[PDB]
Amino acid sequence: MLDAFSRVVVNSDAKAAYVGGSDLQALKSFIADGNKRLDAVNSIVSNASCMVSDAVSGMICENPGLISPGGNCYTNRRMAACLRDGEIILRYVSYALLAGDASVLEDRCLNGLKETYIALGVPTNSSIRAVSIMKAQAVAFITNTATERKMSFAAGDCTSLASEVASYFDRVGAAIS
Amino acid sequence: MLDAFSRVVVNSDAKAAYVGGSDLQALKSFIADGNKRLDAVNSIVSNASCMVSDAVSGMICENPGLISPGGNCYTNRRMAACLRDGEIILRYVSYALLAGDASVLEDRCLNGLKETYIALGVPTNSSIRAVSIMKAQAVAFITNTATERKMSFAAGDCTSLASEVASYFDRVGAAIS
Amino acid sequence: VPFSTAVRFESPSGGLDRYSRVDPAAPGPNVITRFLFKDRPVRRSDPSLSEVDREATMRTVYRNVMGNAYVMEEERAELATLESQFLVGAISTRDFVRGVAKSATYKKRFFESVSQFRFIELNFKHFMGRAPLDMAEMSKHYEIFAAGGYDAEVDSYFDSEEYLDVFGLDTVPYMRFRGTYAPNSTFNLQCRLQGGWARSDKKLPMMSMLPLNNKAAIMPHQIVDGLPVIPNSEHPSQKYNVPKVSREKLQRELLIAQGKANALQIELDAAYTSLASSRAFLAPFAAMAADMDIRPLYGKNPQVFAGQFLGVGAGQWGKTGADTVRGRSRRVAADIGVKEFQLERVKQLVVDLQRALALEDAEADAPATS
Amino acid sequence: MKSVITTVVSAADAAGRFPSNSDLESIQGNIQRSAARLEAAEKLAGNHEAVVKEAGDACFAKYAYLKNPGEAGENQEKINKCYRDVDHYMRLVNYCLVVGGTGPLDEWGIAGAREVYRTLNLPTSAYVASIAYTRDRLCVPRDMSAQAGVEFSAYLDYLINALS
Amino acid sequence: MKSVITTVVSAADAAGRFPSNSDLESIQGNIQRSAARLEAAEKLAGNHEAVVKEAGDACFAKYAYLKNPGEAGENQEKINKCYRDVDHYMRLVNYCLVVGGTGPLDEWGIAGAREVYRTLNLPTSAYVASIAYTRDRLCVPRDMSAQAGVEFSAYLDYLINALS
Amino acid sequence: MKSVITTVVSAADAAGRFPSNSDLESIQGNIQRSAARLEAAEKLAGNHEAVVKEAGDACFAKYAYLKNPGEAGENQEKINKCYRDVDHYMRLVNYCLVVGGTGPLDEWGIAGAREVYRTLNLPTSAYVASIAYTRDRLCVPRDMSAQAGVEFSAYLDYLINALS
Amino acid sequence: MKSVITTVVSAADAAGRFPSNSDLESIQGNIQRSAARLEAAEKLAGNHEAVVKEAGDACFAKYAYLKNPGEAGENQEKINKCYRDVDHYMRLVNYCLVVGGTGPLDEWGIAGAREVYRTLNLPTSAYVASIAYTRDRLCVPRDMSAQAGVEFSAYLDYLINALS
Ligand SMILES: *C(=C)C1=C(C)[C@@H](Cc2[nH]c(/C=C3N=C(/C=C4\NC(=O)[C@H](C)[C@H]4CC)C(C)=C\3CCC(=O)O)c(CCC(=O)O)c2C)NC1=O
Ligand SMILES: *C(=C)C1=C(C)[C@@H](Cc2[nH]c(/C=C3N=C(/C=C4\NC(=O)[C@H](C)[C@H]4CC)C(C)=C\3CCC(=O)O)c(CCC(=O)O)c2C)NC1=O
Ligand SMILES: *[C@@H](C)[C@H]1/C(=C/C2=NC(=C\c3[nH]c(C[C@H]4NC(=O)C(C=C)=C4C)c(C)c3CCC(=O)O)/C(CCC(=O)O)=C2C)NC(=O)[C@@H]1C
Ligand SMILES: *[C@@H](C)[C@H]1/C(=C/C2=NC(=C\c3[nH]c(C[C@H]4NC(=O)C(C=C)=C4C)c(C)c3CCC(=O)O)/C(CCC(=O)O)=C2C)NC(=O)[C@@H]1C
Ligand SMILES: *[C@H](C)[C@H]1/C(=C/C2=NC(=C\c3[nH]c(C[C@H]4NC(=O)C(C=C)=C4C)c(C)c3CCC(=O)O)/C(CCC(=O)O)=C2C)NC(=O)[C@@H]1C
Ligand SMILES: *[C@H](C)[C@H]1/C(=C/C2=NC(=C\c3[nH]c(C[C@H]4NC(=O)C(C=C)=C4C)c(C)c3CCC(=O)O)/C(CCC(=O)O)=C2C)NC(=O)[C@@H]1C
Ligand SMILES: *[C@H](C)[C@H]1/C(=C/C2=NC(=C\c3[nH]c(C[C@H]4NC(=O)C(C=C)=C4C)c(C)c3CCC(=O)O)/C(CCC(=O)O)=C2C)NC(=O)[C@@H]1C
Ligand SMILES: *[C@H](C)[C@H]1/C(=C/C2=NC(=C\c3[nH]c(C[C@H]4NC(=O)C(C=C)=C4C)c(C)c3CCC(=O)O)/C(CCC(=O)O)=C2C)NC(=O)[C@@H]1C
Ligand SMILES: C=CC1=C(C)[C@@H](Cc2[nH]c(/C=C3N=C(/C=C4/NC(=O)[C@H](C)[C@H]4CC)C(C)=C\3CCC(=O)O)c(CCC(=O)O)c2C)NC1=O
Ligand SMILES: C=CC1=C(C)[C@@H](Cc2[nH]c(/C=C3N=C(/C=C4\NC(=O)[C@H](C)[C@H]4CC)C(C)=C\3CCC(=O)O)c(CCC(=O)O)c2C)NC1=O
Ligand SMILES: C=CC1=C(C)[C@@H](Cc2[nH]c(/C=C3N=C(/C=C4\NC(=O)[C@H](C)[C@H]4CC)C(C)=C\3CCC(=O)O)c(CCC(=O)O)c2C)NC1=O
Ligand SMILES: C=CC1=C(C)[C@@H](Cc2[nH]c(/C=C3N=C(/C=C4\NC(=O)[C@H](C)[C@H]4CC)C(C)=C\3CCC(=O)O)c(CCC(=O)O)c2C)NC1=O
Ligand SMILES: C=CC1=C(C)[C@@H](Cc2[nH]c(/C=C3N=C(/C=C4\NC(=O)[C@H](C)[C@H]4CC)C(C)=C\3CCC(=O)O)c(CCC(=O)O)c2C)NC1=O
Ligand SMILES: C=CC1=C(C)[C@@H](Cc2[nH]c(/C=C3N=C(/C=C4\NC(=O)[C@H](C)[C@H]4CC)C(C)=C\3CCC(=O)O)c(CCC(=O)O)c2C)NC1=O
């Protein structure tokens, strides 16, 4: 995998260029906003058990045919195998937000995920809904606009980190269409 | 795998016939020229380290894009795995020169080699003009006409062994075409 | 098991990443391969096994030895007799994986729920970590099953010299990416069998029969799914960057890219005939100066003043080294490398176009609306 | 196909090595022994239908219970398959003297034979009476030469040790 | 690509774990030490044509035997590929100061180097004399700061310890 | 014991490497974060007799149903074992603030807790009600410093997410 | 070791088979070609002091930089351990002409030689320049016969292709 630092290296290795002064300044600004990012990913991994229960119950709360006999989340064993698909998608986003890159999302999390979902008989559109509910939850903790849990932070604004973690959940839903 | 004597048995097994008297006239002339065959694979195996370094570094003389950044012989892991692969091809060609029959080259080496090289990103046109430098090296070592190293043989004529190992080398380039 | 077989066949091959017993301080292979881009294999080296390394060990058991499936909290109760003895040290890593392979967990998934042809496929993958080498090695194991059934066939892998020379008694088995392969076509088959990090083995069809008899060639996009992912490429893949268009728009865009690659091949072949014509143009004179006495004025012995030509001076070595060499055959060679770049760019574009056509035809053959 | 050449290549390929001096020294002993066993092969190639009528009833004179009803060889379409089977086995010995190893007897005649004859109710001792009669009917200066009948009668009792 | 981030993501992904407090604490050391190694990365990116020319003819003034016929400096293409390699190595040290780990020297410069330099007959003591010239001409207040010298020299003798 | 030390040693040993600059920079963030979490540790080690009294009566007010005759929370000698358990969980959180990782919670408090609390019929909702009250009682300038209450509260809800 | 006898016994030991007619045919080639290679063994065993003295100062007439201070062959004890090592390499060539295979060079001279000579800064071009002098100083009717000189100079460039 790569991070935010070795994405600049593999883009300058294609040109045989040293890492100069212009793209060092975009990396020097990554480190200066580094305490925001560790404050950001601490917000999501502290609330991660409530998020995967708010997600896949609300997917069932909109789609009540998934628990009918002949549904994907019908029995008790298949419900735990959707709860396990909540917290792996949420885990690999949490590595991608911590790294500053979407390498670990691409070659591990989405690698072969659609081809598995065809062969099992997973509903395609219902996985787009439960990921986007987790997109609605993740920006609610980065912007601290959650309804029943408030977390204390320093004074400032982190609207750029909430947009970066929103683009990671759209990359999950774009791969399993 | 087969050799030159297992090849004439499976032709005779196809008609359920015994290996008679008229087809033993040619087998006795194979074994009569069997000392030139061992004297020929000894002129390839003795020169085998310089054969795959005259060939891989002569492939670079006709393609500088391999040693450009991003190239196939660019980094040290990639030049080492190409000098590995050039002497696997020389190993299985010398097996078929020793065995008298190209059956060990066609299923242990050349089967599935083309679509192996598509998947890794190996340029297959550069492999064809790499194994054709080794084809011209081998027929200079059989017939004792290399300019920088002469070996001591008995007098005679090994042109039929030269065009038997030449046909094992354009059987390689028909498989990665 | 002291006889284990009965057949006087011709012997198949091994790997090359084995314990050698002569030079045991050698790296060998797996220093220039795709071993470097996997995570490193887990061997038990401490007797304690603290509880976050116990959980990290069994995740490698479900990913590599099981088929990236999910064990529940009742299916992990069937291994609780075997997790007495692996954690204490009474049984090995090799005897633990065999006890996993004879469970009611493994026999429900990989024996009864799949076919017999699919069951022999995974035993080369789950236990040895490779493919069948050829059909002769695979048809031997149908006779080991014909003699003594399941536990005779399962013990054929763990009681082998190819097992203990590679995994030993301590490492969990893994898919092996060594350098040299025993046929070349067993490399393509192990990338078909273990392909993609998120891919399970549940409800997949049997794959390795028609490749092993040279009936169905393995498509080159199915090997790309099996290979571990490198950072740098010449041509990074548009696997995620193909737009969601129909099946008919993917078929037109594939046949256009196959046609552009055919015309790019037969102008690269015209470049090679111009390189062969450029060398024959200068071969009477390249041999004419081969036996001349060309003595320079400086540059070779250090007793004379050479200036910047002690080596080369200050930036003039170039990006490559061959770009600073002039000549008619060096100048047509740089045209070859720019013409082979455009052929390799579009040959890697028909690979991920062929993936999207297969991944849309799996939707159609599954019972659906399109 | 086990021969001399397909076991020094299959050992050199199994360690990733070029053919060395000990591999070229084994092909030399394939040259030296080739005058002997190819004299034995062309002796068997012309004289094959004589020696299988002579060795086929040597099974049947020792075992006359095969022509009982209920047994193996009742009718004339089962006796001729028994003379087909000795000519199958004598052809593979002629193939082994050409390739210089026990290759074509192994995968074509020996492998799977102990489950074919056990299921199809054929006694294996009636097969081996035909091979062992042919082992001592050979006269070592008359038919072939001295050491050429050594390698003819070396592939015959490799078949005898395999069948039982 | 061994960074601080990939050595703790792959540790947490192996046990199936979310990024906990030991994972975030190590990224705070990536913040606290980047000021020392990015100062050496910007001095290397702005001075590199003079530091690989000076180290490149430390090889050729020490080993005059390479210019001999048949030897390893014989024509001008071979000398130009020698200074290219010092320029490849000093670019990979510069990539390692950016990522904070030895990853770009690992997979792009060191893995397979001893097989390539042995096959192509290149003396790896002539590579080491180029790198150890650069490691010993570094003046720690003139050229960078004090703790930028200990990040520059640490990746320099990671390369000497792996090439020989 | 997953500290920041035993994940860079335990990953260099899986590859057979020396400790590199990637491995020393993880320990640099251990020197930065230790001024806050050891300040939160000895704040907890003096106060702990009153916090676990505050942690215990919160779940007996939220779940007062346990004092029925016949189901779980019967007598005072059971209830004194419930104050034993929340003092043990605060003692492990004090141990994690000294380790610098989720080590002592994982192997002494979390592992096997899904089996002990199930077959003895202990609902883990009463434990989360005991210990989320101490997450909310923390006033960030009164009790400790600013970032010292960050690392106190972040080991606490790791214990909440493990139980429920 | 690696010879004709160790190859066909190990191939039959893996298969679990008796030594059959293909195995004895290969040791017949150990009878024919031993007259050539044991002539070259006793020609080397009686002349070895003069041919390692000649091949050792062909190494130092070519790579004259080794006698510099700080280089390899500095003082006289370090030059005398070079002639110790050319004498070990000629003695393993003599052991390979006796056994009939590359096994004594394999196990005792070639295995581990890349790891040792890199970590002690010994140039492998110096060892190759000693072996390649001896292969070119050989005269095919003066020093031995025409068949003894093609076995002797086939173990010499087994060692040139395994070092380089
Ligand atoms: C049916 C019975 C049913 C639903 C439909 C679904 C409603 C729903 N809720 C959200 C959003 C969130 N869930 C969140 C998680 C939590 N909120 C908390 O306060 C605690 C801390 C935590 C649970 C442990 C969060 C943070 C959100 C975001 C907004 C919010 O604060 O409410 C959605 C997503 C909106 C979308 O579809 O985009 C839906 C549909 N839950 C049901 O039970
Ligand atoms: C660029 C600098 C460059 C080339 C261009 C390329 C030249 C080249 N050479 C061949 C042919 C041979 N190489 C051989 C190898 C060796 N010769 C020896 O004597 C030693 C033992 C060994 C090296 C260790 C040999 C024998 C030949 C055959 C020619 C001959 O008779 O000598 C070709 C092949 C032509 C083709 O494409 O068919 C080319 C292009 N090498 C460079 O380095
Ligand atoms: C064509 C490739 C050559 C050439 C070949 C000839 N070789 C001849 C004789 C010969 N070579 C060897 C050695 C060989 N036998 C071995 O057992 C081993 C290794 C273990 C080797 C390398 C021997 C023993 C012989 C002599 C055989 C004999 O004379 O009976 C030869 C002579 C005729 C022939 O043998 O048929 C030829 C023509 N010579 C050439 O001119 C080209 C370059
Ligand atoms: C003692 C055990 C025996 C006995 C043995 C003798 N055998 C002699 C010669 C001999 N044997 C063979 C065949 C052998 N050589 C092979 O290459 C193979 C297989 C591939 C086999 C089985 C041959 C060809 C020869 C003749 C050798 C020659 O012609 O020089 C022999 C004579 C010794 C000799 O001539 O060198 C003896 C004494 N003889 C006995 O009486 C007892 C029972
Ligand atoms: C839940 C939100 C879904 C749904 C999910 C199901 N998934 C089932 C099995 C399954 N899921 C995965 C993907 C997972 N493994 C990975 O390695 C990664 C990423 C790296 C991910 C996301 C796999 C591989 C499998 C198969 C293996 C297994 O059995 O665990 C599943 C059970 C299928 C069955 O009944 O046999 C279900 C129900 N279904 C839904 O309705 C929502 C959309
Ligand atoms: C004769 C001395 C025996 C005997 C022989 C019978 N064999 C019968 C069938 C049979 N045999 C074979 C093996 C044979 N075929 C091969 O291709 C080769 C090797 C290349 C061999 C050795 C096969 C495959 C079969 C079945 C097909 C066939 O009929 O040819 C047979 C018929 C059995 C039946 O009809 O029930 C007989 C009678 N039986 C004897 O009396 C002595 C023991
Ligand atoms: C100068 C100190 C040496 C020398 C240099 C040569 N290297 C040659 C080939 C070569 N070197 C490498 C490693 C290099 N390439 C990389 O990509 C990286 C790291 C990013 C490094 C260090 C490779 C892969 C290759 C082969 C491809 C190429 O030509 O660039 C080389 C050509 C070999 C030859 O023609 O014999 C030279 C000359 N070697 C010398 O001769 C002096 C002592
Ligand atoms: C002359 C060509 C070189 C040279 C020679 C040195 N070799 C040194 C040590 C060494 N060599 C070996 C391999 C050698 N020992 C064996 O037992 C066998 C095969 C049977 C061989 C080929 C070993 C194991 C060792 C280390 C022990 C020893 O001193 O004998 C060596 C000493 C290294 C040192 O102390 O620096 C030298 C000097 N190296 C040179 O300096 C010239 C150029
Ligand atoms: C990016 C990496 C990098 C380096 C490692 C150095 C390497 C380096 N040093 C010198 C150059 C020099 N280095 C010194 C040595 C000195 N020793 C002392 O005790 C003094 C503190 C100091 C002098 C002020 C001297 C005297 C020169 C002058 C020119 C020479 O000697 O050739 C030069 C030539 C001109 C210059 O830039 O100064 C270079 C490229 N420079 C770099 O850009
Ligand atoms: C070990 C793990 C670890 C952490 C969790 C953080 C903890 C943390 N975050 C911040 C510091 C900060 N944190 C935020 C974050 C936020 N403010 C908001 O309004 C958003 C709601 C929210 C995150 C999404 C901001 C805006 C700053 C100030 C910027 C800065 O100090 O660089 C600081 C102060 C840094 C300083 O003093 O300079 C600290 C210690 N750091 C660490 O080392
Ligand atoms: C049975 C026979 C047999 C073979 C023929 C080879 C075929 C082969 N080559 C490579 C692997 C490779 N092959 C090349 C080769 C080349 N790039 C070029 O410039 C040249 C045109 C060409 C040869 C000189 C490279 C560069 C790699 C490594 C890919 C990379 O890491 O960049 C691999 C993948 C190995 C791995 O990584 O595990 C395989 C199977 N192996 C075998 O087992
Ligand atoms: C160092 C780590 C560590 C822990 C995490 C705990 C975990 C733990 N709790 C209990 C054990 C217990 N826990 C309770 C507590 C309760 N049961 C009830 O009836 C109420 C609902 C609830 C109050 C909260 C009781 C009563 C026992 C005694 C066994 C029992 O439930 O009958 C035991 C059995 C031993 C004992 O009796 O103490 C253990 C190991 N103890 C440890 O040593
Ligand atoms: C190390 C861990 C640790 C803790 C989590 C707290 C837990 C705690 N809080 C209080 C006790 C208190 N804490 C506060 C402070 C506040 N109450 C609020 O509701 C506001 C949010 C905030 C003031 C702005 C007050 C006012 C009391 C007394 C009454 C009460 O509990 O509210 C007490 C009683 C004695 C004391 O004040 O210390 C204890 C032990 N103390 C600790 O030592
Ligand atoms: C068993 C291993 C073994 C060897 C490989 C040789 C190696 C060898 N050759 C010569 C010695 C010689 N070799 C030659 C031969 C020739 N010079 C030429 O230019 C012609 C090409 C060729 C003629 C056929 C001559 C003329 C000498 C003596 C002159 C000299 O070189 O000192 C000597 C010195 C004295 C002698 O023995 O003759 C030695 C040790 N001897 C051995 O014991």
**Element at B37 (helix H, strand E):** helix B34-45
Residue E91, ligand 7, Cβ within 6 A: no
Contact D46 B2 (CB under 8 A): no
* Ranges of H-type helices in A103-158: 103-104, 113-120, 124-142
Residue D93, ligand 6, Cβ within 6 A: no
CA G80 – CA C248 distance, rounded (Å): 78
Chain centroid to Cα C21, Å, comes to 26
Angle at F56 between CA F52 and CA F61, to 5 degrees: 150
Q: Are D27 and G7 in contact (CB under 8 A)?
A: no
**Please, what sign has the CA dihedral across residues D146, D152, D158, D160?**
negative
Other Cβ atoms less than 10 A from the Cβ of C46: the count is: 9
- Residue among F76, F78, F107, F159 to mutate when testing ligand 12 (max atoms within 8 A of CB): F78
CA B49 – CA F136 distance, rounded (Å): 73
Contacts of B46 in chain G (CB under 8 A): 154, 157-158, 161
**CATH number for the domain including E19?**
1.10.490.20
Q: What are phi and psi for residue D162, nearest 5 degrees?
A: -85, -40
Q: Are E97 and E152 in contact (CB under 8 A)?
A: yes
In 3D space, the residue among D107, D101, D95 whose CA is nearest the CA of residue D27 turns out to be D101
Answer left, alpha or beta for residue D102, where phi above 0 means left and psi between -120 and 50 means alpha: alpha
Residue A85, ligand 5, Cβ within 6 A: yes
Contact C337 B61 (CB under 8 A): no
Ligand 11, atom 18: closest residue by C-alpha: B72
Tally DSSP H helices, then E strands, for chain E. Answer: 10, 0
Give the minimum alpha-carbon distance from C60 to chain A in angstroms, rounded to a whole number. 15
Task: Name the residue range of residue A172's domain.
Answer: 1-177
Contacts of E60 in chain C (CB under 8 A): 310-311
In 3D space, the residue among C129, F154, D57, C111 whose CA is nearest the CA of residue E25 turns out to be F154
**Please, what sign has the CA dihedral across residues C176, C178, C182, C184?**
positive
Q: Which ligand 13 atom is nearest residue F46's CA? A: 43
CA A82 – CA B22 distance, rounded (Å): 74
Nearest by CB to residue C341, choosing from B65, B119, B120, is: B65
CA-based end-to-end distance of chain C? 53
* Ranges of H-type helices in chain D: 5-12, 21-32, 34-46, 48-62, 76-99, 103-105, 113-119, 125-136, 152-163
Answer left, alpha or beta for residue B123, where phi above 0 means left and psi between -120 and 50 means alpha: beta
Other Cβ atoms less than 10 A from the Cβ of A132: the count is: 17
CA C99 – CA E89 distance, rounded (Å): 50
Q: What is the DSSP string of F55-99?
A: HHHHHHHH--GGGSSSSS--SHHHHHHHHHHHHHHHHHHHHHHHH
In angstroms, the Cα distances linking F110 to F84, F113, F159, F164 are 16, 5, 8, 11
Task: Name the residue range of residue F13's domain.
Answer: 1-164
Chain centroid to Cα B51, Å, comes to 11
Angle between helices E34-45 and A22-32 (to 10 degrees): 180
CA-based end-to-end distance of chain B? 24
**Please, what sign has the CA dihedral across residues E111, E115, E118, E121?**
negative
Q: Give the CA radius of gyration of chain G.
A: 18
CA C176 – CA B115 distance, rounded (Å): 20
In angstroms, the Cα distances linking D154 to C170, D37, D102 are 47, 11, 10
In 3D space, the residue among B15, B27, G25, B16 whose CA is nearest the CA of residue D42 turns out to be B27
Ligand 14, atom 28: closest residue by C-alpha: G137
Chain centroid to Cα B125, Å, comes to 18
In angstroms, the Cα distances linking B169 to B62, B133, D10, E69 are 19, 10, 21, 32
Tokens of A50: 């409530």
Burial of E25 (0-12, 13-18, 19+ CB in 10 A): buried
CA G164 – CA G160 distance, rounded (Å): 6
Q: What are phi and psi for residue C208, nearest 5 degrees?
A: -95, 60
3-state SS assignment for residue E74: coil
**Number of domain units in chain A:** 1
Q: Are C218 and C192 in contact (CB under 8 A)?
A: yes
Q: Are C157 and C95 in contact (CB under 8 A)?
A: no
Q: What are phi and psi for residue D136, nearest 5 degrees?
A: -110, 0
CA B4 – CA B11 distance, rounded (Å): 11
With tokens 């030509």, the residue in question is C309
**Element at E98 (helix H, strand E):** helix E76-99
CA-based end-to-end distance of chain F? 22
In 3D space, the residue among E134, E144, E140, E84 whose CA is nearest the CA of residue E109 turns out to be E84
Q: Are G26 and G4 in contact (CB under 8 A)?
A: yes
**Number of domain units in chain F:** 1
Residue B16, ligand 2, Cβ within 6 A: no
CA B105 – CA B110 distance, rounded (Å): 6
SS (H, E, C) chain C: CCCCCCCCCCCCCCCCCCCCCCCCCCCCCCCCCCCCCCCCCCECCCCCCCHHHHHHHHHHHHHHHCCCCCCCCCCCCCCCCHHHHHHHCCCCHHHHHHHHHCCHHHHHHHHHCCCHHHHHHHHHHHHHCCCCCCHHHHHHHHHHHHHHCHHHHHHHHHCCHHHHHHCCCCECCCCCCCCCCCCCHHHHHHHHHCCCCCCCCCCCCCCCCCCCCCCCCCCHHHHHCCCCCCCCCCCCCCCCCCCCCCHHHHHHHHHHHHHHHHHHHHHHHHHHHHHHHHHHHHHHHHCCCCCCCCCCCCCCCCCCCCHHHHCCCCCCCCCCCHHHCCCHHHHHHHHHHHHHHHHHHHHCHHHHHHHHHHHHHHHHHCCCCC
Strand partners, F45: none
What is the 3-state composition of chain A as percent helix, strand, coil, each rounded to the nearest 5?
Answer: 70, 0, 30
Nearest by CB to residue F111, choosing from C42, C51, C73, is: C51
Name, in order, each residue with C-beta under 8 angstroms of A129's C-beta and a sequence gap of 6 or more.
A59, A62, A63
In 3D space, the residue among C121, C127, C69, C71 whose CA is nearest the CA of residue C98 turns out to be C127
In angstroms, the Cα distances linking D95 to B22, D4, D40, D90, E162 are 15, 14, 11, 9, 57
Give distance in angstroms: CA of F117 to centre of ligand 1.
29
Name, in order, each residue with C-beta under 8 angstroms of C113's C-beta and a sequence gap of 6 or more.
none
CA D2 – CA C340 distance, rounded (Å): 45
Other Cβ atoms less than 10 A from the Cβ of F129: the count is: 18
Other Cβ atoms less than 10 A from the Cβ of C247: the count is: 13
Strand partners, C43: C171
How many inter-chain contacts (E to G, CB under 8 Å) are there?
21
Tokens of F71: 């189901």
Residue A1, ligand 1, Cβ within 6 A: no
Other Cβ atoms less than 10 A from the Cβ of G59: the count is: 25
CA D12 – CA D19 distance, rounded (Å): 7
Angle at E84 between CA E80 and CA E87, to 5 degrees: 145
**Element at A59 (helix H, strand E):** helix A48-62
CA C78 – CA C104 distance, rounded (Å): 7
Contact E116 B81 (CB under 8 A): no
What count of Cα atoms within 13 Å lies in the side-chain half-sphere of residue G11?
32
Tokens of F161: 């997410």
- Residue among F120, F121, F159, F163 to mutate when testing ligand 12 (max atoms within 8 A of CB): F120
Output b/e per residue, F135-159; b: 16+ Cβ within 10 A: beebeeeebbeebbbbbbbbbbbbb
Output the CA torsion E135→E141→E147→E153 (10° steps): 0
In 3D space, the residue among A44, D79, D153 whose CA is nearest the CA of residue D161 turns out to be D153
What count of Cα atoms within 13 Å lies in the side-chain half-sphere of residue B56?
26
CA-based end-to-end distance of chain G? 22
CA C44 – CA C58 distance, rounded (Å): 12
In 3D space, the residue among F55, F116, F58, F133 whose CA is nearest the CA of residue F88 turns out to be F55
**Element at F47 (helix H, strand E):** helix F21-62
Contact E110 B76 (CB under 8 A): yes
CA C300 – CA E76 distance, rounded (Å): 11
Nearest by CB to residue E34, choosing from A6, A31, A108, is: A31
Residue G81, ligand 8, Cβ within 6 A: yes
User: Chain G contact for C280, CB < 8 A?
Assistant: no
Burial of D147 (0-12, 13-18, 19+ CB in 10 A): middle
Give distance in angstroms: CA of B124 to centre of ligand 7.
23
Give distance in angstroms: CA of D156 to centre of ligand 7.
61
CA D101 – CA G19 distance, rounded (Å): 11
Q: Are A142 and A165 in contact (CB under 8 A)?
A: yes
Tally DSSP H helices, then E strands, for chain G. Answer: 10, 0
Please note each residue after which chain G is broken, C-to-N distance over 2.5 A, or write none. Answer: none
CA G151 – CA G134 distance, rounded (Å): 13
Q: Entry resolution in angstroms? A: 2.8
User: Chain C contact for D1, CB < 8 A?
Assistant: yes
Subunits adjacent to chain B (3 or more Cβ pairs under 8 Å): A, C, D, E, G
CA E96 – CA E78 distance, rounded (Å): 27
Give distance in angstroms: CA of C171 to centre of ligand 11.
27
DSSP assignment letter at E144:
S
D98, amino acid identity:
V
In 3D space, the residue among A16, E73, C321 whose CA is nearest the CA of residue B60 turns out to be C321
CB-based touch A/G (3+ pairs, under 8 A):
no
What is the 3-state composition of chain E as percent helix, strand, coil, each rounded to the nearest 5?
Answer: 75, 0, 25
Strand partners, C171: C43
Ligand closest to Cα of B104 equals 11
Contact E124 G114 (CB under 8 A): no
C204, amino acid identity:
L
Q: Are F55 and F44 in contact (CB under 8 A)?
A: no
3-state SS assignment for residue D48: helix
CA A89 – CA A131 distance, rounded (Å): 8
Q: Are D44 and B18 in contact (CB under 8 A)?
A: yes
In angstroms, the Cα distances linking F162 to A54, A56, A90, C66 are 17, 19, 16, 26
CA G146 – CA C9 distance, rounded (Å): 41
With tokens 């046929």, the residue in question is C183
Angle between helices A86-99 and A124-142 (to 10 degrees): 50
How many inter-chain contacts (A to E, CB under 8 Å) are there?
93
Q: Are D130 and D86 in contact (CB under 8 A)?
A: yes
Angle at B32 between CA B28 and CA B36, to 5 degrees: 140
Q: Are F153 and F97 in contact (CB under 8 A)?
A: no
**Element at A53 (helix H, strand E):** helix A48-62
CA B62 – CA E82 distance, rounded (Å): 20
In 3D space, the residue among C316, C323, C28, C68 whose CA is nearest the CA of residue C198 turns out to be C68
DSSP assignment letter at G107:
I
Burial of C177 (0-12, 13-18, 19+ CB in 10 A): buried
In 3D space, the residue among F14, C333, A22 whose CA is nearest the CA of residue E45 turns out to be A22
**Element at F153 (helix H, strand E):** helix F148-163
Q: What are phi and psi for residue G77, nearest 5 degrees?
A: -70, -30
Give the minimum alpha-carbon distance from D30 to chain G in angstroms, rounded to a whole number. 6
CA A62 – CA A64 distance, rounded (Å): 6
CA B124 – CA G47 distance, rounded (Å): 52
B109 annotated as belonging to a binding site for a ligand: no
Name, in order, each residue with C-beta under 8 angstroms of A66's C-beta and a sequence gap of 6 or more.
A59, A60, A72, A73, A74, A123, A126
DSSP assignment letter at G109:
I
CA C212 – CA C138 distance, rounded (Å): 9
C32, amino acid identity:
I
User: Chain F contact for A35, CB < 8 A?
Assistant: no
Q: Are A97 and E9 in contact (CB under 8 A)?
A: no
Contacts of E121 in chain G (CB under 8 A): 125, 164
Q: What are phi and psi for residue G18, nearest 5 degrees?
A: -75, 160
Ligand closest to Cα of F91 equals 12
Tokens of A138: 């993740």
